Protein backbone atom coordinates (compact mmCIF):
# COMPACT_ATOMS: atom_id res chain seq x y z
CA UNK A 1 0.00 0.00 0.00
CA UNK A 2 2.81 2.44 0.81
CA UNK A 3 4.68 1.86 -2.46
CA UNK A 4 2.11 0.97 -5.12
CA UNK A 5 -0.32 3.80 -5.88
CA UNK A 6 -3.44 3.90 -8.10
CA UNK A 7 -5.10 1.15 -6.04
CA UNK A 8 -7.95 3.35 -4.75
CA UNK A 9 -9.58 3.60 -8.15
CA UNK A 10 -13.25 3.66 -7.15
CA UNK A 11 -13.08 6.64 -4.78
CA UNK A 12 -11.03 8.64 -7.28
CA UNK A 13 -13.56 7.83 -10.01
CA UNK A 14 -16.46 9.03 -7.85
CA UNK A 15 -14.68 12.27 -6.95
CA UNK A 16 -13.71 12.92 -10.57
CA UNK A 17 -17.26 12.32 -11.79
CA UNK A 18 -18.74 14.75 -9.27
CA UNK A 19 -16.10 17.41 -9.94
CA UNK A 20 -16.52 17.14 -13.71
CA UNK A 21 -20.31 17.43 -13.46
CA UNK A 22 -19.94 20.58 -11.37
CA UNK A 23 -17.35 21.97 -13.79
CA UNK A 24 -19.56 21.51 -16.84
CA UNK A 25 -22.54 23.00 -15.00
CA UNK A 26 -20.50 26.09 -14.10
CA UNK A 27 -19.07 26.34 -17.61
CA UNK A 28 -22.58 26.20 -19.10
CA UNK A 29 -23.19 29.68 -17.59
CA UNK A 30 -21.32 31.39 -20.46
CA UNK A 31 -23.40 30.71 -23.59
CA UNK A 32 -25.36 33.21 -25.66
CA UNK A 33 -28.25 30.76 -26.24
CA UNK A 34 -29.25 32.99 -29.15
CA UNK A 35 -29.41 36.18 -27.07
CA UNK A 36 -27.16 39.22 -27.42
CA UNK A 37 -24.78 38.44 -24.55
CA UNK A 38 -24.23 35.85 -21.83
CA UNK A 39 -24.44 38.38 -18.96
CA UNK A 40 -27.70 39.89 -17.75
CA UNK A 41 -26.14 43.20 -16.70
CA UNK A 42 -25.00 44.09 -20.22
CA UNK A 43 -28.44 43.54 -21.77
CA UNK A 44 -30.01 45.36 -18.82
CA UNK A 45 -27.78 48.43 -19.26
CA UNK A 46 -28.03 48.44 -23.06
CA UNK A 47 -31.71 47.84 -23.89
CA UNK A 48 -35.10 49.05 -22.63
CA UNK A 49 -37.59 47.13 -20.44
CA UNK A 50 -40.25 46.65 -23.16
Amino acid sequence: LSSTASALGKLQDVVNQNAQALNTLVKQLSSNFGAISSVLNDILARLDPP
Binding site: I36, A45, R46, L47, D48
Partner: protein, 198 residues
Protein backbone atom coordinates in the same frame (compact mmCIF):
# COMPACT_ATOMS: atom_id res chain seq x y z
CA UNK B 1 -21.24 71.16 -46.49
CA UNK B 2 -21.74 68.24 -48.87
CA UNK B 3 -20.90 64.54 -48.56
CA UNK B 4 -19.90 62.21 -51.36
CA UNK B 5 -22.19 59.97 -53.44
CA UNK B 6 -23.18 56.38 -52.67
CA UNK B 7 -20.21 54.77 -54.45
CA UNK B 8 -17.57 56.02 -51.99
CA UNK B 9 -19.10 57.12 -48.70
CA UNK B 10 -16.83 59.05 -46.37
CA UNK B 11 -15.55 56.65 -43.72
CA UNK B 12 -14.54 58.29 -40.44
CA UNK B 13 -13.00 56.60 -37.41
CA UNK B 14 -13.74 58.61 -34.25
CA UNK B 15 -11.59 58.00 -31.18
CA UNK B 16 -10.32 59.79 -28.07
CA UNK B 17 -13.40 61.98 -27.63
CA UNK B 18 -16.08 62.85 -25.09
CA UNK B 19 -19.38 62.12 -26.84
CA UNK B 20 -22.67 63.64 -25.67
CA UNK B 21 -25.61 62.17 -27.60
CA UNK B 22 -28.03 64.08 -25.35
CA UNK B 23 -27.60 67.22 -27.47
CA UNK B 24 -28.57 65.09 -30.48
CA UNK B 25 -31.65 63.40 -29.01
CA UNK B 26 -33.40 66.60 -27.90
CA UNK B 27 -32.80 68.19 -31.32
CA UNK B 28 -35.98 67.15 -33.15
CA UNK B 29 -34.68 67.99 -36.62
CA UNK B 30 -34.62 64.47 -38.10
CA UNK B 31 -37.05 62.57 -40.32
CA UNK B 32 -36.30 59.09 -38.96
CA UNK B 33 -34.41 57.95 -35.86
CA UNK B 34 -34.68 54.15 -36.11
CA UNK B 35 -31.85 53.10 -33.76
CA UNK B 36 -31.88 49.43 -32.78
CA UNK B 37 -29.52 47.34 -30.67
CA UNK B 38 -29.21 50.13 -28.09
CA UNK B 39 -32.02 52.02 -26.41
CA UNK B 40 -31.31 55.69 -27.29
CA UNK B 41 -32.46 56.95 -23.89
CA UNK B 42 -29.77 54.89 -22.10
CA UNK B 43 -26.83 55.78 -24.35
CA UNK B 44 -25.09 58.45 -22.26
CA UNK B 45 -24.20 56.03 -19.43
CA UNK B 46 -22.46 53.50 -21.68
CA UNK B 47 -19.11 53.83 -23.43
CA UNK B 48 -16.89 51.64 -25.55
CA UNK B 49 -13.86 51.52 -27.83
CA UNK B 50 -14.78 53.82 -30.73
CA UNK B 51 -17.34 54.45 -33.47
CA UNK B 52 -17.44 54.29 -37.26
CA UNK B 53 -19.36 57.11 -38.94
CA UNK B 54 -20.26 57.33 -42.62
CA UNK B 55 -22.56 59.75 -44.44
CA UNK B 56 -24.36 59.80 -47.78
CA UNK B 57 -27.53 60.86 -49.59
CA UNK B 58 -30.32 58.70 -51.03
CA UNK B 59 -33.88 59.08 -52.28
CA UNK B 60 -36.79 59.56 -49.89
CA UNK B 61 -38.31 56.19 -50.76
CA UNK B 62 -35.27 54.01 -49.96
CA UNK B 63 -34.95 54.89 -46.26
CA UNK B 64 -36.38 51.53 -45.18
CA UNK B 65 -33.77 49.74 -47.31
CA UNK B 66 -31.10 50.54 -44.70
CA UNK B 67 -31.79 47.88 -42.06
CA UNK B 68 -30.35 44.44 -41.23
CA UNK B 69 -31.72 41.49 -43.14
CA UNK B 70 -33.44 43.61 -45.80
CA UNK B 71 -33.45 42.84 -49.52
CA UNK B 72 -33.34 45.47 -52.24
CA UNK B 73 -31.24 47.12 -54.91
CA UNK B 74 -29.29 49.50 -52.66
CA UNK B 75 -29.08 47.39 -49.48
CA UNK B 76 -27.17 44.64 -51.34
CA UNK B 77 -25.10 46.44 -53.99
CA UNK B 78 -24.48 50.04 -52.88
CA UNK B 79 -24.41 49.48 -49.09
CA UNK B 80 -24.60 46.03 -47.50
CA UNK B 81 -25.64 46.32 -43.86
CA UNK B 82 -24.86 43.11 -41.94
CA UNK B 83 -27.41 41.44 -39.69
CA UNK B 84 -25.71 42.58 -36.49
CA UNK B 85 -25.40 45.57 -34.13
CA UNK B 86 -25.21 48.53 -36.54
CA UNK B 87 -25.61 51.31 -33.97
CA UNK B 88 -28.14 53.98 -34.96
CA UNK B 89 -29.57 55.24 -38.25
CA UNK B 90 -30.30 58.94 -38.83
CA UNK B 91 -32.09 60.34 -41.88
CA UNK B 92 -33.20 63.93 -42.41
CA UNK B 93 -34.95 65.78 -45.22
CA UNK B 94 -32.83 67.90 -47.59
CA UNK B 95 -35.10 70.18 -49.61
CA UNK B 96 -33.80 73.72 -49.00
CA UNK B 97 -30.28 72.91 -50.24
CA UNK B 98 -30.14 69.60 -52.11
CA UNK B 99 -33.46 69.86 -53.96
CA UNK B 100 -33.18 73.62 -54.56
CA UNK B 101 -29.89 73.58 -56.48
CA UNK B 102 -28.82 73.34 -60.11
CA UNK B 103 -26.47 70.43 -59.46
CA UNK B 104 -28.68 67.91 -61.24
CA UNK B 105 -25.62 65.76 -62.10
CA UNK B 106 -23.94 65.65 -58.69
CA UNK B 107 -25.97 62.86 -57.04
CA UNK B 108 -25.34 59.42 -58.53
CA UNK B 109 -26.65 55.88 -58.16
CA UNK B 110 -25.87 52.50 -59.69
CA UNK B 111 -28.04 49.98 -61.56
CA UNK B 112 -25.23 47.44 -62.04
CA UNK B 113 -25.89 43.75 -61.43
CA UNK B 114 -23.86 40.57 -60.90
CA UNK B 115 -21.77 42.55 -58.38
CA UNK B 116 -23.04 41.34 -55.00
CA UNK B 117 -21.18 43.29 -52.32
CA UNK B 118 -20.32 41.96 -48.86
CA UNK B 119 -20.86 43.99 -45.66
CA UNK B 120 -18.53 47.01 -45.54
CA UNK B 121 -16.71 46.96 -48.87
CA UNK B 122 -16.37 49.70 -51.48
CA UNK B 123 -16.15 49.38 -55.27
CA UNK B 124 -15.13 52.73 -56.78
CA UNK B 125 -14.15 51.07 -60.09
CA UNK B 126 -16.12 53.12 -62.64
CA UNK B 127 -16.10 51.09 -65.86
CA UNK B 128 -18.63 50.87 -68.68
CA UNK B 129 -20.28 47.46 -68.93
CA UNK B 130 -18.94 45.51 -71.92
CA UNK B 131 -18.89 41.79 -71.18
CA UNK B 132 -17.35 40.78 -74.50
CA UNK B 133 -18.67 37.24 -74.07
CA UNK B 134 -21.84 35.21 -74.56
CA UNK B 135 -24.03 36.99 -71.92
CA UNK B 136 -24.18 40.28 -73.84
CA UNK B 137 -26.30 39.30 -76.88
CA UNK B 138 -23.24 37.52 -78.28
CA UNK B 139 -21.65 40.75 -79.56
CA UNK B 140 -18.73 42.66 -78.06
CA UNK B 141 -19.04 46.42 -77.64
CA UNK B 142 -22.83 46.47 -77.40
CA UNK B 143 -24.97 46.52 -74.24
CA UNK B 144 -22.87 49.44 -73.02
CA UNK B 145 -24.52 49.92 -69.62
CA UNK B 146 -23.21 53.02 -67.87
CA UNK B 147 -22.67 52.14 -64.18
CA UNK B 148 -23.72 55.59 -62.91
CA UNK B 149 -26.83 57.70 -63.42
CA UNK B 150 -27.94 60.91 -61.75
CA UNK B 151 -30.83 61.72 -59.42
CA UNK B 152 -33.27 63.66 -61.58
CA UNK B 153 -34.64 66.28 -59.20
CA UNK B 154 -36.58 69.52 -59.62
CA UNK B 155 -37.48 72.36 -57.25
CA UNK B 156 -40.28 70.90 -55.09
CA UNK B 157 -41.45 68.10 -57.37
CA UNK B 158 -42.74 65.87 -54.57
CA UNK B 159 -41.99 64.29 -51.19
CA UNK B 160 -41.44 60.56 -51.70
CA UNK B 161 -38.53 61.11 -54.09
CA UNK B 162 -36.98 64.05 -52.22
CA UNK B 163 -33.27 63.67 -51.35
CA UNK B 164 -32.67 62.42 -47.80
CA UNK B 165 -29.38 62.87 -45.96
CA UNK B 166 -28.48 59.65 -44.14
CA UNK B 167 -25.80 58.89 -41.55
CA UNK B 168 -25.43 55.42 -40.01
CA UNK B 169 -23.24 54.80 -36.97
CA UNK B 170 -21.45 51.58 -36.12
CA UNK B 171 -20.32 50.64 -32.61
CA UNK B 172 -18.16 47.72 -31.52
CA UNK B 173 -17.58 46.11 -28.13
CA UNK B 174 -14.92 43.91 -26.53
CA UNK B 175 -12.15 44.83 -28.96
CA UNK B 176 -10.00 47.29 -27.00
CA UNK B 177 -10.12 49.42 -23.84
CA UNK B 178 -12.77 52.12 -24.05
CA UNK B 179 -11.53 55.38 -25.56
CA UNK B 180 -14.64 57.50 -26.19
CA UNK B 181 -16.88 57.94 -23.15
CA UNK B 182 -19.78 60.13 -22.13
CA UNK B 183 -19.69 63.08 -19.73
CA UNK B 184 -19.76 61.82 -16.14
CA UNK B 185 -18.14 62.68 -12.82
CA UNK B 186 -15.42 60.55 -11.23
CA UNK B 187 -15.61 60.08 -7.45
CA UNK B 188 -13.08 58.92 -4.88
CA UNK B 189 -12.55 55.25 -4.03
CA UNK B 190 -13.75 53.38 -0.94
CA UNK B 191 -12.48 50.15 0.60
CA UNK B 192 -14.19 47.31 2.47
CA UNK B 193 -17.80 48.40 2.02
CA UNK B 194 -19.17 46.04 -0.67
CA UNK B 195 -20.01 48.89 -3.03
CA UNK B 196 -21.18 48.95 -6.62
CA UNK B 197 -18.79 50.36 -9.18
CA UNK B 198 -18.52 51.44 -12.82
Amino acid sequence: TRFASVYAWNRKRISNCVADYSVLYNSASFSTFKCYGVSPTKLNDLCFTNVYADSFVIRGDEVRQIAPGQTGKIADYNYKLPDDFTGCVIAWNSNNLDSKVGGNYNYLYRLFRKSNLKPFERDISTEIYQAGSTPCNGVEGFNCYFPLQSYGFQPTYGVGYQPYRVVVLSFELLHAPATVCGPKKSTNLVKNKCVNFN
